[PDB]
Amino acid sequence: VGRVHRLLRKGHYAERVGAGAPVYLAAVLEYLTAEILELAGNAARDNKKTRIIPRHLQLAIRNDEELNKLLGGVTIAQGGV
Amino acid sequence: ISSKAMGIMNSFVNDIFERIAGEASRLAHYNKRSTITSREIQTAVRLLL
Amino acid sequence: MGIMNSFVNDIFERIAGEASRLAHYNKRSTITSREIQTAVRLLL
Amino acid sequence: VHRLLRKGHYAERVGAGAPVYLAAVLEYLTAEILEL
Amino acid sequence: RDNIQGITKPAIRRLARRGGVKRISGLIYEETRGVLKVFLENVIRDAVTYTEHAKRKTVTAMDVVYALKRQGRTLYGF
Amino acid sequence: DNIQGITKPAIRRLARRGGVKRISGLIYEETRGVLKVFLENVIRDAVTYTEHAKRKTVTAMDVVYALKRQGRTLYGFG
Amino acid sequence: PHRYRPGTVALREIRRYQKSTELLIRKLPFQRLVREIAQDFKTDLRFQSSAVMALQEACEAYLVGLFEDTNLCAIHAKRVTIMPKDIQLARRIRGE
Amino acid sequence: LLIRKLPFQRLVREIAQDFKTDLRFQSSAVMALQEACEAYLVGLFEDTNLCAIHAKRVTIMPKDIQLARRIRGE
DNA sequence: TTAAACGCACGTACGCGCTGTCCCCCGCGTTTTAACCGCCAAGGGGATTACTCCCTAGTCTCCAGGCACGTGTCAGATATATACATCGA
DNA sequence: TCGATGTATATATCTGACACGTGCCTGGAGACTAGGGAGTAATCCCCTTGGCGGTTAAAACGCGGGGGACAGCGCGTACGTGCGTTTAA
């Protein structure tokens, strides 16, 4: 929570930052992260593997229309098509 | 999890963080306010996502 | 007339944006002529 | 240009040459567009 | 609802004529209506979001300019 | 003149990944111009960013900056 | 003798290369190409191995997508052979 | 302008009614949206004409629009 | 020193131009709907100002959370024998 | 239609990328003085919504007939599959 506040103050995003901003931003980033990893883990289980690799990230992202809409321009190295 | 997957996740987090901070700053500039509050972050989230 | 008055501020914001990015990329506390020249070379 | 550079929070300090160069570039490009 | 029928055939024909189309199939009209509907829906949603954040009740030109700018097109004159 | 280093099999493999079943004999000479122009436009920006730091060794992040300015954000190199 | 019919191998190559994920351009020839290209901008330039790797990943990912786009406007003419005009049209429609 | 003003104004208020009730609109916002829509449609038809010429045809048809949008990534 | 690109002739499949034919864009006409101009009503809401307060910036202390360094072991790997699926004359 | 080619599986063996423990240090947390940006309250008055009369612009419905799109055939020569030569990675 502290790191977010520090980066905000040092980034010139605004001259002042309220107390509630970092908890909200952290909750958002945690939610999105859990959503990504849950699908990547399911794809790994579906591939009888036990360690997640970039290919699984590509397959999980490109199979969801919402994540694919958010990350339409992003290129994943070693991801392929 | 392999080291490369964590490496990709780090850039993913830095990207979304910068997008949200961007939109929150633009909204604050538009309304002529000096500070960022949960309302600005919530608006940025609803506009970018 | 409004078109030109918008065009000027638009390019102003674009160039100042690139100058800000050039400043942040080097953790510099002051924007200088080198930053503006590099922004111009990057945009044009 | 200098005022906007200070108010925009682009940096904590602004050199004297930055706004002069930015104004010169904006004027040059403005004339280039208006001519065409 | 039926208000979508207000985009008459002659207006679409005039637009296609300016676009250099020499011959127009009779099925182009419904496709054009759907494309216009989705474009308007997105721009209006963005404008309403900016209007609501400011706690305003009137929708002004600035909310439209900002929406269009976000979609990736810049409109000069407003 | 190393452009001849882009051999026919490599181009065929890339087109194969794209699902192309039949390839005309003129595609080979057409692809080289596209690849050369893309590389020149990326390298000029990467070198510009490296020069901004007054460094003499080009670094991966400078290339990330070049691609990001063009809208080609690359994930995997931090 | 034994012989496969024309076009049956092409499908096998498509099915093969879309399942694998390795790089397809030769490392050394690509590196030499980048080295030759960079000489036009500045002398005594140096490149880390990861910078050239980044350029390679970018080029392969871009060209695959361009061929995917070109195939649609090639097929649109009821053909199967892709030709230069299909690339020219795709690039014109993309505005690049 | 080429689209009738009154029907377009009613179209705008109809779309807006789905998001918030008792909304109000300035006289210039509707015309701004109208200018945006007319420019967008002119551009899409211009792009569709090349896809039509590509098959050596004269009549433009829906598949030309769908192809242009699919390649544009809309 | 071995596996990568380069070269060869064979040949079946594709691209391309010809016709024959019937349907559905385009144009001119008579009709009729409502777009538009101008004038009347009137109140919900925008633009500016003052009161005064309670949330955030700057300075200092101290501590336990997280960065470099080292360990060692098991998850993914080539290689093998071979299994059975797919395509063609 | 089955048998010649190709890709998939089940097994023993393998080695180096990763999960875990350590020391210690620089940033985060707790307490204070301070002050100005920001929440609330009030007025002025505009400009947006709702209605009326009416006069012709544009949209509407026919129907005539011929430009064009479409299915079909024939033919000629480009690029695909496989063998051998040979190049530099």
XYZ file of C-alpha atoms in Angstrom, chain H residues 4 7-8 10 12-13 15 28-30 34 36 53 58 63 70 73-74:
18
model
C -32.357 15.764 -41.171
C -34.873 13.027 -36.525
C -31.207 12.963 -35.500
C -34.677 12.561 -31.456
C -29.719 11.275 -29.722
C -32.281 11.756 -26.969
C -29.940 6.793 -26.987
C -24.259 22.322 -29.992
C -23.694 18.794 -28.625
C -26.219 17.174 -30.966
C -24.045 14.626 -36.244
C -18.955 12.932 -36.247
C -13.492 -2.845 -56.998
C -19.590 -2.442 -59.695
C -19.641 -8.436 -47.533
C -12.958 -7.005 -39.989
C -10.405 -4.437 -36.377
C -13.643 -2.732 -35.341
